[PDB]
Design a binder for this molecule. Sequence first.
Ligand SMILES: CCCCCCSC[C@H](NC(=O)CC[C@H]([NH3+])C(=O)O)C(=O)NCC(=O)O
Ligand SMILES: CCCCCCSC[C@H](NC(=O)CC[C@H]([NH3+])C(=O)O)C(=O)NCC(=O)O
Lengths: 209, 209
Amino acid sequence: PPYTVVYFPVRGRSAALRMLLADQGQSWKEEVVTVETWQEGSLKASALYGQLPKFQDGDLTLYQSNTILRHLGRTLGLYGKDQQEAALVDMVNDGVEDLRAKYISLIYTNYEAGKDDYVKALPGQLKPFETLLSQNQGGKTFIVGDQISFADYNLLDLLLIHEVLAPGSLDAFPLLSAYVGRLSARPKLKAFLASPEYVNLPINGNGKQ
Amino acid sequence: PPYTVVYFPVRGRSAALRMLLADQGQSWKEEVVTVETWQEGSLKASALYGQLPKFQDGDLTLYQSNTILRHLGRTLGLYGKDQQEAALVDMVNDGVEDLRAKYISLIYTNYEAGKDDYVKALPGQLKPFETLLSQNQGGKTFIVGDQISFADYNLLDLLLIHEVLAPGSLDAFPLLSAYVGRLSARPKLKAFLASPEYVNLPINGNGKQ
Ligand SMILES: CCCCCCSC[C@H](NC(=O)CC[C@H]([NH3+])C(=O)O)C(=O)NCC(=O)O
Ligand SMILES: CCCCCCSC[C@H](NC(=O)CC[C@H]([NH3+])C(=O)O)C(=O)NCC(=O)O
């Protein structure tokens, strides 16, 4: 630390890292980049893949949302208790990333045309996270082990946004409904999710949710 | 260990994790899964995300290619010498991953109508790794730091398949170029890249490369 998130006035691929910081009792600066600022071409030109988020941690500069997440898991001890759990944390997040890339591509690339095909495939896509949960202490704690990981935040954000896209898509998944239900209640995380820092922001950058 | 890779008879997403093992002088078994056996559906059904590659390491069963990359870097010490190097290695891999997604979506979804545009875009897509490899002792060792990482096996394969795509695609990048020969000159890799079980193996499995 200190932490700075440099991003568009959208939740997008920073919603989960932001949650993590907040749940962890941490504080950060929000650097905001409007499309106008981005349209200047100054930020993009330095950015390693011409894309945001950008994260500064003390004197360390990072791109890629999952790098940032992994770096915070590695520093705040949110990467499982051991080398097995490390691997299972990854498996979970890689799975989140896969569904998220699908979600993004629907939203930005063809929303109204694909929504039906997307939401149809959704139960099949959520079932492995129910399974995962049911194979660890009975879905009673976290997605991996019995302490919180970066994969938990990234997955929490995945389900929240999906409840907006497809109201009631978690009915069929009891363990997962209680898990969003429980993890939201975590005191600092309740507060963060109610902050205008979050609430004032739309999920996506194109009107679509 | 011991190691087992379960996958279709292609290079695909088990290509980078096999170079790693070979160069690391390690050995492994192959569970070949033809398309016809996959259509039977009992393997599909048991896989966490219904997909391959699948990997067994001693008692651990893993899915997700980068998870197997990460698991391997962590056990064999191919994840940078420190915390910062770790975060940059992930930054490379995520960037490799992003170009692999796009190539995979060219190969399987619109090869015939996508290609000229794709190769058109290749230089300005390969440049980010040319940069990183510059800002790291002038390009003379590895993508990150001075010892090999899982991010180097993944990028190396990414660069090899793209040479098959458009032969001579790497000339506008003389740095990324010698990188490829350095890594393939490594006696353990060299020999595997000359074995049939690498040369006789299809890249993508749909007659397109
Ligand atoms: C312009 C409004 C965009 C706001 C929507 C979300 S950011 C979209 C895009 N960034 C990304 O796709 C980030 C992906 C990156 N691989 C990650 O996971 O962090 C971007 O910076 N795009 C700009 C560019 O690539 O030039
Ligand atoms: C004909 C030979 C083709 C083999 C190459 C395709 S393997 C493609 C697919 N696997 C994946 O997309 C893996 C994605 C995963 N995110 C990873 O990187 O490990 C799969 O198991 N697909 C099968 C399915 O989903 O039914």
